[model samples]
Target: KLDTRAMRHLTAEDWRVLTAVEMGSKNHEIVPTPLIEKIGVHKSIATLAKAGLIARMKEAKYDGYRLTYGGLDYLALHTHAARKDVYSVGSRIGVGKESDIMIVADEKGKQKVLKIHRLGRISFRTVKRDYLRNRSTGSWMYLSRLAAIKEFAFMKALYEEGFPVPEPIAQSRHTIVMSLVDALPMRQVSSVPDPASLYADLIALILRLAKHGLIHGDFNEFNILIREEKDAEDPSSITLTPIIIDFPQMVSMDHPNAEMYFDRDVQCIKRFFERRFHFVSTTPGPFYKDAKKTVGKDGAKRLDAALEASGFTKKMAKDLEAAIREQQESR
Candidate 1:
């Protein structure tokens, strides 16, 4: 839905004004024209506004403008293009209420997955303009950027700790670029030769993440991708690897609702196995209390703490959580 055709034609002054709008938004909801004039290096506000990068409000309170989603997309693409990470944007591979997954390619024609976070979108439909007008800094743009930041930080931590996740390339604004994963989501997999084994593997993965002091808050079938691999020597033998995705809602093991999140993740896998594979474990459970005790055990690094140590402050976590909760409840 994002039209990138105008990106190539944007003049340097236009980009400067667009970026000034974004910077001015940090303090003002609708950036005042005087402020833009002070920050922008040229008389380019009209240029950006005409290109649909920014929008002028109709209200008489003040003559000001706000950066549109198109403007954000242009900034993100500009960063990727400057870094040579994204040469051309491609078709959408996945769409969700809060995000869009697009296929992009680098200058070398290597494909990558670009996830654009659009948090607080559902609120626009349900809550409308009432609350948004009251909250000065809680704009959709800020919330979406928080979501991308959390997802990128979590993905990098998990990938470094040997988790089966996509390779995080870079993040800019509300978008994150990751290595393209060529696999089908677990929801699309109707039948498997060994459902019991797959079920156990998934359960083990949950526990492994627990050992690392983190919980995948949304461990549903849709967030899990099943990658199929065949042996070269014996093509008859195949292996299935579960690659985890979607980490914006990941919670720390020390969180107050950690037990609830851990249990829900385990139950998600259990319920899916029962419904799809008709397989249920005779053993009781991989209980939350047991996993709670396993946090940081056996030299397992505390990924939750690791992320915090890497400058993910508590305020950022709380803000992202509130926005995610708002969006989920709106649905």
Candidate 2:
């Protein structure tokens, strides 16, 4: 019933049983007489047990069934059956105001990060306020879905634009899988490889984000990753790349407060560079000009075209460019 043909042949009852076991349920716990009578599957557990999908363990008058490794693998295959869909599970990676991050592994055993939106735990009033502030429909479900879609779209767009963001692999409703930044989260690291050069890179990335017509509403050290350079000649050389993650709240120029958001982001970067990295620039004006120069005259237009060709809407392209302009003018 659940289309298990592409994977191993499994019946609806098998799926139900396997799913329950995968979630840590036991066999006898699942197949009591009352449960059988309630679900009308009297022989389901016995059949699955005979099929080797479950193994029984006995411990002094108590016995229960749990999924075997084979069963677990089968379920995983069927659940994430698409070629593009990757999966992994590990200790929780990070926690945020709205979501929890998990490190997952792909088919090739490469690490990918999954951001699971906490739909039940989210602050409804806060979400409602943010949703209503936008020009679009303020319905709760629509806003939540729109936010999820934006995260996926941003990852795909940035990857295609050659902007060094994660490669979005799969998404199921509120959960997203994407390439994991190899370095540890910035907050836990006490040292940077090259403060001056890294600051320059950060400035350049900020400009790039602007030119692309988006503002990372919450760009900061915590969301940044200081990745180790794989082939560096000097171990101490701060040549590691700076990667930005966590972009669910990112805003475009269409928002009334886009300029304010852009300016705040830029200012935060400037402040961090000056305070921690010991770089001082009296005015934000020069930095803004340099960032614009970094984008070049046609760079934003080229990037927008690339985004459009990559399946972004025309309005999104326009809004993205406007966000960049807002950043440039924020100086």
- For each candidate, the alpha-carbon lDDT, in order, equals 0.83, 0.57
What's the lDDT of the predicted structure labeled candidate 1?
Answer: 0.83
TM-score of 2: 0.59
Model 1: residues >4 Å from true position, as ranges?
40-43, 123-138
What lDDT tens digits, residue by residue, belong to model 2 across residues 150-174?
6777777777777767777776544
Model 2 gets an lDDT of: 0.57
Which digits, one per residue and each the tens of the lDDT, describe model 1 over residues 252-309?
8889989888998888888988898888987678999999999889999888775576
The segments of candidate 2 whose C-alpha lies over 4 angstroms from its true place after superposition are 1-84, 119-143, 230-232, 286-331
Question: In terms of TM-score, which candidate is strongest?
Answer: 1
After aligning candidate 2 to the native by TM-score, how far in Å is the CA of 320 from where it should be? 17
